Symmetry: D2
Subunit: 186 residues, 4 copies
């Protein structure tokens, strides 16, 4: 993995997603060199950069032009990005312009989760995987329900991570806010 500290960040754009979470997203996604992936709400680019180096084509979407700008910087810096199509704009409309996908990671929904998912279902190639990253309690509930209603077998794993911070004398355990991963299939 590309460590979190190698991500240039713009304080107005969240991310990158916790390395341990991005690691699990990749395990769940099972990126293949012939896969076409979409990262809805690319933010700082934490998920996009990892997908960039493992799949054929990645479509990174974001409402915020700054997120688009920051994701491109991190890509440029890590020598990735020539197989990444950046798309500024609201997800539903952006999603309609791309081809079918093998992998769909929803890093942000902005109130349009349900709409985003329905669309993703219609574009998901057979054997495709959907992974929704949820920090809001509502999102965890809505992602679960949405995917079930669309006919998927849904699973949810919540991660509570703590890392050692050498805080002058000992190692203090500093926790990261919990993040849940709602993912489809069996």
């Amino acid at each position: 993995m590309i460590p979190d500290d190698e991500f240039i960040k713009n304080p107005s754009v969240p991310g990158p997603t916790a390395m341990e979470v991005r690691c699990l997203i990749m395990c769940l996604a099972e990126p293949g060199k012939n896969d076409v992936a979409v990262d809805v709400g690319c933010g700082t680019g934490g998920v996009t950069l990892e997908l960039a180096g493992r799949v054929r084509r990645v479509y990174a979407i974001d409402r915020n032009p700054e997120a688009i700008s920051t994701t491109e910087m991190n890509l440029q810096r890590h020598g990735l990005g020539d197989n990444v199509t950046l798309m500024e704009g609201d997800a539903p409309e952006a999603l309609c312009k791309i081809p079918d996908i093998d992998i769909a990671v929803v890093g942000g929904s902005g109130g349009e989760l349900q709409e985003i998912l329905r669309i993703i279902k219609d574009k998901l190639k057979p054997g495709g995987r959907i992974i929704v990253t949820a920090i809001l309690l509502e999102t965890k509930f809505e992602a679960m329900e949405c995917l079930r209603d669309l006919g998927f077998d849904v699973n949810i794993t919540e991660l509570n991570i703590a890392r050692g911070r050498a805080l002058d004398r000992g190692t203090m355990m500093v926790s990261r806010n919990p993040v849940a991963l709602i993912y489809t299939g069996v």
Copy 2:
């Protein structure tokens, strides 16, 4: 329990200890109206205030004179403090001046945990309880090994707490750093 946001802070002083943790500290301590308690490293006063309203006499110790002033402000602010003896100074010398104790909560050791624990065993009335609050990995190990070496039946419980926060479009789970409670048999 006095909510955490009703504690007057001071930048140099850590605390108050997470309400959920203070709650468990009290459950493990089993405060009695005829108990004499000592709060080693009172900090902001989170543990001292709770003990104040439940036991006969509380001895609150701290190296930081600002921890002493902040604990006083909080004691006065909540109408408590007439059964609290504040003691500024390093714990080992401060501990030697107090009578025997029924309850001992170690909220901070500053490198002298082992010494602090030994003195505490010497002043512990029968049936007394010792509870060490540990945020450093090293402290969790030492508190366990030390209390066992002093002949106590030891236990440890770690709490990972997450609370909700109305975040910009919903409810975000904001985790608190993990805190372990190393305690001796009652």
Copy 3:
């Protein structure tokens, strides 16, 4: 707090609720000697026993006759139960037969959470507290929306508890399933 291992379990009855959770429930409930409390879904009696020794009258409700029997057994074993009115039956019908309450703990809803909460609100005395114990993701969401819709100031805390256990001459950390407490402003 009455230790978890001092509770007799029945195969068809869940519980007792984790001591650390019961501890927090009590901190949030702030039991007073003149309080009238209701424990919806008493199960094994974990919450009922604690309330029994702190309030004036407790109304313990449960669908399962085996739960009513176990809660009754555990009270007797602990010399409690004279201020406890056991009520077998579905929560809504039973809730309508009791007087107004100062404290309401919902330990189980069985699909009728919303109904149970509406009824509790209609019977809550001024300054009363409601605490819902949620292990199901749906319940955490449902309790939050419902309490707000009923005009309450809602809060949620999710505890992840780990307890040390002897293993290989060392100490292994054993986790308990996470439990969330959804409670209203006091």
Copy 4:
């Protein structure tokens, strides 16, 4: 990742290590096709199988003849194993017979952690990575002190994982015991 439920368990051999933990071990290990790895205490084979399909040669060690049998069995069922050298015996003895390593995962130490680590240092190729999986509190402390003492830049990450399970028409969260990963520098 090879799903957890796709490993055959022997009742006397622990494992496989939680998929989410094995996922992170791989992220931290950064397996390369020309890497030589050693899995100290292979148990059920959770770490060995993952390394098998990513590196050049893997040396899987275990005291338990049954652990060696379970690992070979799981290797065979997944069509792996031709690049895995199984070694029954105590780790230090076994570690001395293998060539230098790029990756070292310590899945079990059995009281000889310090010795095992000192030896791993003596055979670690430049740019090599060491990752110790710790479930015992003592091991977390020990791994840190030892690795610091051997001159490494040490880090610790503690994972608390919860997975949803269908219960009473809802989804309850089921936690796994916490596991810490103590790993070395660049």
